[PDB]
Design an enzyme around this catalytic site. Structure first.
Site, PDB file in Angstrom:
ATOM      1  CB  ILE A  36      63.163  55.295  36.963  1.00 36.10           C
ATOM      2  CG1 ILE A  36      62.781  56.495  37.851  1.00 36.10           C
ATOM      3  CG2 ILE A  36      62.380  55.231  35.661  1.00 36.10           C
ATOM      4  CD1 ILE A  36      62.726  57.852  37.101  1.00 36.10           C
ATOM      5  N   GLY A  37      63.771  53.755  40.110  1.00 33.79           N
ATOM      6  CA  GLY A  37      64.792  53.731  41.136  1.00 33.79           C
ATOM      7  C   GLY A  37      64.273  53.601  42.520  1.00 33.79           C
ATOM      8  N   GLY A  79      63.263  57.119  49.427  1.00 40.27           N
ATOM      9  CA  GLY A  79      62.024  56.751  48.775  1.00 40.27           C
ATOM     10  C   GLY A  79      62.113  55.947  47.493  1.00 40.27           C
ATOM     11  CB  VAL A  80      59.696  54.261  45.531  1.00 43.69           C
ATOM     12  CG1 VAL A  80      59.570  53.567  44.185  1.00 43.69           C
ATOM     13  CG2 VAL A  80      59.861  53.241  46.654  1.00 43.69           C
ATOM     14  CE  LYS A  88      64.095  60.330  46.252  1.00 45.24           C
ATOM     15  NZ  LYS A  88      65.389  60.958  46.536  1.00 45.24           N
ATOM     16  CG  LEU A 125      67.962  64.567  33.709  1.00 44.65           C
ATOM     17  CD1 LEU A 125      68.456  65.236  32.437  1.00 44.65           C
ATOM     18  CD2 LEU A 125      66.949  65.413  34.411  1.00 44.65           C
ATOM     19  CG  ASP A 143      74.619  58.642  48.845  1.00 45.78           C
ATOM     20  OD1 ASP A 143      75.784  58.073  48.841  1.00 45.78           O
ATOM     21  OD2 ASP A 143      73.528  58.065  48.662  1.00 45.78           O
ATOM     22  CD  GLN A 192      72.001  53.025  41.475  1.00 41.36           C
ATOM     23  OE1 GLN A 192      71.962  53.293  42.690  1.00 41.36           O
ATOM     24  NE2 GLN A 192      71.683  51.795  40.979  1.00 41.36           N
ATOM     25  CG  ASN A 193      72.411  59.808  43.840  1.00 40.90           C
ATOM     26  OD1 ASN A 193      71.251  59.396  43.773  1.00 40.90           O
ATOM     27  ND2 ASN A 193      73.080  59.826  44.970  1.00 40.90           N
TER      28      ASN A 193
END
Ligand SMILES: C[C@@H](O)[C@@H](C)Oc1nc(Nc2ccc([S@](=N)(=O)C3CC3)cc2)ncc1C(F)(F)F
Length: 284
Positions: A10-11, A16-17, A33, A78, A122, A126-127
């Site tokens: 999902i991101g 990380g991934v 994560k 979420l 940051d 997207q966050n």
């Protein structure tokens, strides 16, 4: 990590991934994560800090898995990020009451982080993560200082001008740009490099001087040679934001971080007099 079945990526970001995943034992659906790299002993304690830092508007850190000299963070899941919701809402716009709810809630989270001396550093659409009940939560921070193409669009000028010890006011700056973007449906400062970012800020808000921002001309990456642009009126920058919205936005977008409004004072701004918590229409 044996304990989770990955459902889907999902991101991806700096640290990380992220996968949507299921706890194989208990069936819980989480965001997993995987931190890109032995782990340093000071990221371990910084992460221990974060696990306690709980607030309704901060994505919950459920478990920290430091095994086989890797780090995984297991977060609550979420169902949508604000970038996707903005994109999905582009034809009509997000309704003002909903923008105002989200801005209120994100100030509340930021106010909490900041009373704890934790900075996000940051913030971006997207966050920021939403649910069907009308909540929004900050994600993917403490990460920034714990560990030590990137978007620059939400970057505060003090950071672009080379300040090494920045303050919570960088998060208010970010949240400002995001507010504006929700309202106009365009990115306020869509830079594609550090100087393009800084000059797009400078053409809208005017090139900063010692009058608007004492100290500015001695910052590491300040150059007397910068062009001289005039500031524009916010009536041109963010129609259809009403005068209260604009009053607040200008305070969040002050050049001098020390003049820039704090999350706590922003929560008292007259803009939030009539705040409500509407339910978003999410297509999942
Ligand atoms: C902060 C950042 O890293 C996202 C990816 O992280 C997280 N994301 C979520 N949920 C999520 C759900 C749907 C979407 S989506 N792209 O709108 C749709 C599939 C396309 C995105 C994110 N939940 C927890 C985290 C976190 F790990 F932070 F706890």
């Amino acid at each position: 990590m044996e304990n989770f079945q990955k459902v889907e990526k999902i991101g991806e970001g700096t640290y990380g991934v992220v996968y949507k995943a299921r706890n194989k034992l208990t069936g819980e659906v989480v965001a997993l994560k995987k931190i890109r790299l032995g782990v340093p002993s000071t990221a371990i304690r910084e992460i221990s800090l974060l696990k306690e830092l709980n607030h309704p508007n901060i994505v919950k850190l459920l478990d920290v898995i430091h095994t086989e000299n890797k780090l995984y963070l297991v977060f609550e899941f979420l169902h949508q990020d604000l970038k996707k919701f903005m994109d999905a809402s582009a034809l009509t716009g997000i309704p003002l009451p909903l923008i105002k709810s989200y801005l209120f809630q994100l100030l509340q989270g930021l106010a909490f982080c900041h009373s704890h001396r934790v900075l996000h550093r940051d913030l971006k659409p997207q966050n920021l993560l939403i649910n069907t009940e009308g909540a929004i939560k900050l994600a993917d921070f403490g990460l920034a200082r714990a560990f030590g193409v990137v978007t620059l669009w939400y970057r505060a000028p003090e950071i672009l001008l080379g300040c090494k010890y920045y303050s919570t006011a960088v998060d208010i700056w970010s949240l400002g740009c995001i507010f504006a973007e929700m309202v106009t449906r365009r990115a306020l400062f869509p830079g594609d490099s550090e100087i393009d970012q800084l000059f797009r800020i400078f053409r809208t808000l005017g090139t900063p001087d010692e009058v608007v921002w004492p100290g500015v001309t001695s910052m590491p990456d300040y150059k007397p040679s910068f062009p001289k642009w005039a500031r524009q009126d916010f009536s041109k920058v963010v129609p259809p934001l009403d005068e209260d919205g604009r009053s607040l936005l200008s305070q969040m977008l002050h050049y001098d971080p020390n003049k820039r409004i704090s999350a706590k004072a922003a929560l008292a701004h007259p803009f939030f007099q009539d705040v409500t918590k509407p339910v978003p229409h999410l297509r999942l």
